[PDB]
Amino acid sequence: DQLFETVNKMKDSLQKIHKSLANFNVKIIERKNRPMSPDDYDQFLKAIFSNKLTIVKDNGNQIQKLVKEVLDAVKADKKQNSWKNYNDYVNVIVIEGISTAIQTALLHLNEQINPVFIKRNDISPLFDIRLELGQSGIQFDPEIGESSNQLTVRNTIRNWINDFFNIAGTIQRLDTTMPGDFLQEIRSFFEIKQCLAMITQNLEWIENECNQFRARFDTYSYLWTEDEQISFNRFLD
């Protein structure tokens, strides 16, 4: 019974660790029906992101406590190598689970972010873009580009991608190091890189065709704004 109960506790702990990881990934992004605004999505998304981040941390705390229970059930010294090898294995499963959860959230964004899936569906538009005439050129409120300054769709999407990466802090490693990062391990995964790479390709595709659509207005309207009024005299002779 002592041997049996200890084995069940070890099996129960591993099973509990796996179940917690699956529930925590959820949906990374939720679409609230009709379009609002870029800043607005960050505003509406920020409330959802905080709740999702807190839930992931709560699941992580339970998994960390579950690991402590195994040592009590096993009654094996931490110094012994056998426990150390097992300790790394639990951490690896959590890492693998985090990669799958982050991958699902990124994949959900890809279906919304990629145009071909969107064209087939009746979902159509999600984000909202504002166009204001600019003397230097036609300028969008989003500005369609990486930019690296002020606010842009790529900068926001870039912030969105960081939130999945941010879930790394909640895990706080598995054992041996009190303070540990999880972004380096998740970034290393080949599967995570492919999903991230796919998202970047979709963003570039809309910008190209989008530039062509903006170019048609730019062929005559942009040229007009640039020319000075005193150009009327030149037209006469």
How far apart CA 19 and CA 12 sit, in angstroms, is: 11
Q: Tokens standing for 235?
A: 């037209």
| Burial classification of residue 173, based on how many CB atoms lie within 10 Å of its CB (0-12 exposed, 13-18 middle, 19 or more buried) | middle
What contacts 24+ positions apart, CB below 8 Å, involve 160-165?
A: 160/28, 160/29, 160/45, 160/109, 161/106, 161/196, 161/199, 163/28, 163/49, 163/52, 163/53, 164/28, 164/102, 164/105, 164/106, 165/102
How far apart CA 230 and CA 1 sit, in angstroms, is: 99
Instruction: Provide the 10 A C-beta neighbour count for residue 126.
Output: 16
